[PDB]
Amino acid sequence: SKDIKQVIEIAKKHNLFLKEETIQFNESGLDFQAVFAQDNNGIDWVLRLPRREDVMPRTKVEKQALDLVNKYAISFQAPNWIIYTEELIAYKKLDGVPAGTIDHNIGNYIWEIDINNVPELFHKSLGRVLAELHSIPSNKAAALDLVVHTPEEARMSMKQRMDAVRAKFGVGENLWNRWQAWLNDDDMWPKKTGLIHGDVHAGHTMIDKDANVTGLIDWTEAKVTDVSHDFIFNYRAFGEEGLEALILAYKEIGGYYWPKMKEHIIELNAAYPVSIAEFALVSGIEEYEQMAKEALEVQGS
Template sequence: MKQSEIIHLAKQEGLLLSEESFKINESGVDFRVAHATDLQGEKWILRIPRQKESMRHAIIEKRALDILSGNVTFQVPRWSIFTDQLIAYQQLDGVPAATIDMEQQVYVWELDEQNPPEEFYRSLGKAMAELHTLDTELLKDAGITIIEGKDMRAAMKERMNRIKQHFDIHPALWERWEKWLANEQIWPAHSGVRHGDLHPGHILINEESAVTGFIDWTEVSVGDVSFDFTAHLQIFGKEGLQKLLDAYGAAGGRTWSGMAAHIEEVKAAGAIVVAEYALVSGLDEMHKMAIQMLGASE
């Protein structure tokens, strides 16, 4: 969709945007994201679905955001426009901790990724703890997926089997997953509200590298909160994960003795998420990525 078409869509909803202010980010799988300023100088974020399937969770995401916005202290988007072709909200304070350079396929950071400031860890741990300990009853009527602690291993086994019906999985990878399922000691006994796609591009920070909010809640659910730590482990390694877990626990996040080990196994099962999306979206590039990931030993 061209810039002029996006501006026209916004105009139809009463939002008049400056053409000169437009900047489009193409890194999202489900949505193009445009940054723009209206005629009064207010900054806006516009999300344009890449395909019809991109909107599969949109109404659920909106319900969840409406609930979260009144129950957490960090910022979340509040959608002013919500149609089949356009989602728009006023830009939140802060900037993404990193954005993806599409040509180089690397993160461009707003902080020192080699040595993230203590304030980043402190504030990220605090925000995640607040989210994960939120009363799940608040979201019971939002339509989001809810998996209780006692059902987590069975739900994961079901997902594994479903993927195995459609893809070849490396025997060593499958064996690792089965050992993980059998190791009840490292699984959490509780569930919590989770973002579901918490990577640096969805974490907003201020000039002091303090976390101000989270964006892009397409995968919000109630379940195993460990999934929200996997991107951090991928980027910052075990040492960075431990720093975050320390900050998380200090802020009231619920931890358990096998948490770090469990997060490592969740990360090793990341191909399941990619394969599931490949099946839902029908995208050839996602299918190829899933085949590659599932064919590796780890």
């Protein structure tokens, strides 16, 4: 209605000319509302209409990350914010579809990944993608505002996050002991860091009809750190088998490998309660405070 033209008008002041009749809306989170549309050449676009000021400084890092990945990576797509203003952020839609279920819709047509029948190409192509991504020059990231860890900084970071969560909620004795055993085991910790995506899940992985990964979306957590974060999805969704398949493909295409790689990722998975507790602190939401204490194995009732 009055919204549609408003979009058409905002587009014109940024040199983007749309077909009024193709527009679809999507999630309007705390920060922006999303719009789908075609331009007059038939190309599909994603438009973000901000609904809060500070949209520039909030997105600066993600825009730097997206520009870096676009410059260096050629075996997968990432959003390329070729309109980047206070009024409008817009990019050409990536190829393919997000893996997994397509929620928030009528009908129940597209379902979650079937772990009994994962195509081998899925793990192989994700290993290709992560190996290329993690090889992007960290020196170039360091010239930007991204967080850049050495391997010792990544280890210290985990140590510090664990201490901060313990100070707020406490942590069960056996779990704390397991976390500290991991932190103190030199053989577990990688001796290299690389640029990660930082938010790898099924819904952030774009796939083609053969389940080849063609792109990744949602890059707000990108940083140079322990690459192990980007293997967690495979372990949680596909078990040890899917984790091992991804490690093998990554290792074979030339990604950094170390002998305790798989065991380290599983210990990092066992530190998931740190992240639940961090969200409970940041959000203040009672449900996640409850979830954080059970996951931290604090004796409850």
